[PDB]
Design brief:
Main location: nucleus
Order of helices and strands: EEEHEHEEEEEEHEHEHEEHEEEHEH
Structural class: alpha/beta
Bound molecules: nickel (II) ion
Subunit structure: Binds constitutively to TP53BP1. Binds CDC27, which is itself a component of the anaphase promoting complex (APC). Binds PIAS1.
GO biological process, one term: cell division
CATH architecture of the largest domain: 4-Layer Sandwich
Keywords: Cell cycle, Cell division, DNA damage, DNA repair, Hydrolase, Isopeptide bond, Metal-binding, Mitosis, Nucleus, Phosphoprotein, Ubl conjugation, Zinc, Zinc-finger
Number of helices: 8
Shape: globular
CATH superfamily of the largest domain: Ribonuclease Z/Hydroxyacylglutathione hydrolase-like
Largest sheet: 7 strands, mixed
Family: Belongs to the DNA repair metallo-beta-lactamase (DRMBL) family.
Amino acid sequence: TCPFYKKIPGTGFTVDAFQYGVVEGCTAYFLTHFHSDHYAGLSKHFTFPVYCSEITGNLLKNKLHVQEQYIHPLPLDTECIVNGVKVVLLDANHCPGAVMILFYLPNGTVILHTGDFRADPSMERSLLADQKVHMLYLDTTYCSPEYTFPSQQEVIRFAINTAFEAVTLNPHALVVCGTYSIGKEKVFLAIADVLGSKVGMSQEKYKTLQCLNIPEINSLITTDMCSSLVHLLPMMQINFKGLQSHLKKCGGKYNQILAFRPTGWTHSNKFTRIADVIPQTKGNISIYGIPYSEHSSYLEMKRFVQWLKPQKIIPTVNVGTWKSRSTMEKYFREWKLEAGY
Ligand code: NI
């Protein structure tokens, strides 16, 4: 049944709750972003109102064929009224179109639902600064102190420098980048920019990218693989067997592959700096796992929450085990005692 951490008290609302059938008493279904664990359940047969960003609404219409009459896109950073309740959508710094949702309950309670987010100090100057938030529904994906990672800018600097050196040393090398969802577009777009190439990809993935309002996108991507030396493939194909097979397909145009897997966290992070990352190599194929995250590090999460000073925290990730729930609650209490709220 629908878990309590997907329901907004004092409303008829749910958040990311599309796989439970008709949720009894739900008058508006919100969707924070287009990732499958969150939209699971939606299709052309859905006939309840869906509230979301413009970008998420483009993907619902074009990829899932949800009918236009049930898509309700809202502008960001704008006070809107939904079924009699004031809401605001904020940028979540996750994937394209991802939002956090502020609810202003008729009784005076203010609720923030972060959806999935990568906390950032820039959020301390949004419409969040303007009033008190009583309850926080928090993306706790990496809520433990072992999870450190570099800035997205440092990681993209490493990828660009690695790629540019490799292809300048060997103009017959091919660059390949894995993907299995929207997000992390900067990885493949920044590398294609430094090399003077478009990114080549399947018709399905090109369609998906054309929904994202990215400026000048027609100049950066293509379905013509032959004219491109940065290829995108499913994340599943980013292994030595999958890559040897792809290289055969390119008909002797290339004699080397340099591949990137933008993982979340991996335990090489506890020891190794970005400067010191090395690939796995077999023959003329090298694979780099790079820690490009679209979720908060532990320290980023902690800073946001200590700034916001909520009265109650409701985790939305890692809630399935008692040891995880107990560990998170201990960190929440530490943060509150250290900061004094
Ligand atoms: Ni997500």
